Structure formats: structure tokens, C-alpha cells
């Protein structure tokens, strides 16, 4: 078992609690980067190496722009950190306490939330016995974006081109 997926999921939730308590965009980006790396680990354990590395790389690139933007647009004299503010620390502690409570309840008994029913057992239990051979199912399914999914490529490329046009138009001014 080793509970590696559960530990990683808990760290994922912790990073979300951080950047959602919202200290300041520098530390929000730091927490989001931690969460992206940990999610890469979770999906690597579940099987998708390409998907994990891709989401990690995309969020590393995206948060690089956010740093430059918060240096220019979203900075103040004394940037707030988690312990610097009463509201930020309160929200951070609330999120951590909620995560701890739900984790403890799930481990102690099969916890049914007011939304969904969860069973405390093995993420290794839920896996499938069967195997593939001499190819990666994830890689083949992703590579099927060009043979299958011609429509998806068309709409995605159109959206990206129009996105360039839009960002040029919004920031025109005048």
C-alpha cells in the first residue's frame, strides 16, 4: 500500500489551501507550483507519465508569467505572507483543520460526505489486474488526437489563433 497516493493527495490539498488563503501572488504561485508538482506525482503513480510531466511543464511556464506580472501589477510595499495577516492565517488554519478532520474521519471509518460516499481502503485495491503489451495505452490515446479527433484539433487551433487576436485587441487602448 504505502499510502503514497494518499500522502500526495494531502500535500495537493495543502498547496491549494495555501494559494487559496491568498497571501500574495508570489506565494500563491509558489503554492500552485508545489500543487502542480505533487499532482504530477499523483498521476505518475496512477499511470500517466506524459500527462503528469505535461501539466507540470505547463504550470511551470504559466507561473513564470505570473511572477513577472505580480512584480509589475500586483505588488505592494509589504507583501503579505501566511503569518503576516490575521485573515490569511485564519483561512489557512481553517483549510488545514478541515483537511485534517476529513482525513482522520476517512481513515477511522468509511466517511460518507454530505455530497459523496467515500470508502477508506486501498488505492492499490481499486487498480486493474490486466496489462498491455509493447505500447503505452496513455501514449497511444494521446497520439490519437491527430488520427481521431480531427474536429478537436480544428476547434483548438482556431481558439488559440483567436486568443492571440483577442489579447492583442484587449490591450490596444486608445
Amino acid at each position: 500500500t504505502m499510502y503514497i497516493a494518499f500522502i500526495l493527495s494531502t500535500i495537493f490539498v495543502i498547496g491549494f489551501v495555501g494559494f487559496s488563503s491568498k497571501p500574495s501572488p508570489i506565494y500563491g504561485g509558489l503554492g500552485l507550483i508545489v500543487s502542480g508538482g505533487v499532482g504530477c506525482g499523483i498521476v505518475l503513480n496512477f499511470g500517466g507519465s506524459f500527462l503528469g510531466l505535461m501539466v507540470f511543464l505547463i504550470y511551470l511556464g504559466g507561473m513564470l508569467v505570473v511572477f513577472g506580472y505580480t512584480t509589475a501589477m500586483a505588488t505592494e510595499m509589504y507583501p503579505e505572507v501566511w503569518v503576516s495577516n490575521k485573515t490569511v492565517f485564519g483561512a489557512f488554519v481553517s483549510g488545514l483543520m478541515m483537511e485534517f478532520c476529513m482525513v482522520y474521519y476517512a481513515l477511522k471509518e468509511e466517511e460518507v460526505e454530505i455530497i459523496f460516499k467515500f470508502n477508506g481502503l486501498g488505492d492499490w485495491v481499486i487498480y486493474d489486474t490486466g496489462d498491455s503489451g509493447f505500447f503505452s495505452e496513455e501514449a497511444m490515446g494521446i497520439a490519437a488526437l491527430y488520427s481521431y479527433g480531427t474536429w478537436l484539433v480544428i476547434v483548438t487551433g482556431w481558439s488559440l489563433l483567436i486568443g492571440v487576436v483577442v489579447i492583442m485587441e484587449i490591450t490596444r487602448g486608445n
Binding site: 505535461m54 504559466g62 505588488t75 494521446i142 488520427s147 480544428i154 489579447i167
Partner: protein, 115 residues
């Protein structure tokens, strides 16, 4: 497992180096030594004031083009398909639309830094 052990080893070695650096030498600290550096004179303002970014549009375009390359990365596996003509058409379609985005921004002066 092995990769986790490798990451742990690297982080532990770096942290030990920091610990040795901050605890081995003799330390003498006073307000003048730890003051911020600005070539011998005091800083007029603060380093936390807003710092204008003259390439704000190139950054957004970088986000979009970064996800374009994310789309392009699974091409080596896409070359093993039986639908080679469709695969080649869609790959060239994505690359041509990327080129069109670059051409549009270049001609509309999106690549020029603000003055």
C-alpha cells in the same frame, strides 16, 4: 521509489551545505552590514514598488504558444498511426496556425516593447 530516493539525497545534500555555510564560520552582524546594496549610497525608494514590464504582451503570447507546443509534443507517437495522411494534415494545420499567429502579432507590432 528510486527517483524519490534520488530527490531526497539531492535535497539533503544541498540543505546540509546550507547548514554548514550558516553555522561553521564566525558571524558578526550589525545594521550597517546587513543594509541593502545600492552601490555605496542608500536606496531612495523600495525594491517592492511596481516595476513596469515592457514585454507584457509577449508574455501572454508565450502562454498561448507554450500550450501550442504542449499540443505538438505527442507527435512522435502519432507517426505510428495507419492514418498517416490525416495525421500529417492535422500536424501541418497546427503548425501553420501557429505560424499565422506569429505573423499576425509581428505585423500588428505585438513583438515591439512598450516605450
Amino acid at each position: 521509489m528510486n527517483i524519490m530516493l534520488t530527490l531526497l539525497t539531492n535535497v539533503t545534500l544541498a540543505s546540509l551545505l546550507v547548514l554548514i555555510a550558516f553555522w561553521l564560520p564566525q558571524l558578526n552582524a550589525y545594521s550597517e552590514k546587513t543594509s541593502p546594496y545600492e552601490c555605496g549610497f542608500d536606496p531612495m525608494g523600495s525594491a517592492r514598488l511596481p516595476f513596469s514590464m515592457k514585454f507584457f504582451l509577449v508574455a501572454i503570447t508565450f502562454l498561448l504558444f507554450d500550450l501550442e507546443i504542449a499540443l505538438l509534443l505527442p507527435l512522435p507517437w502519432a507517426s505510428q498511426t495507419n492514418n498517416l495522411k490525416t495525421m500529417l494534415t492535422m500536424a501541418l494545420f497546427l503548425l501553420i496556425l501557429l505560424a499565422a499567429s506569429l505573423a499576425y502579432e509581428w505585423t500588428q507590432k505585438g513583438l515591439e516593447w512598450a516605450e
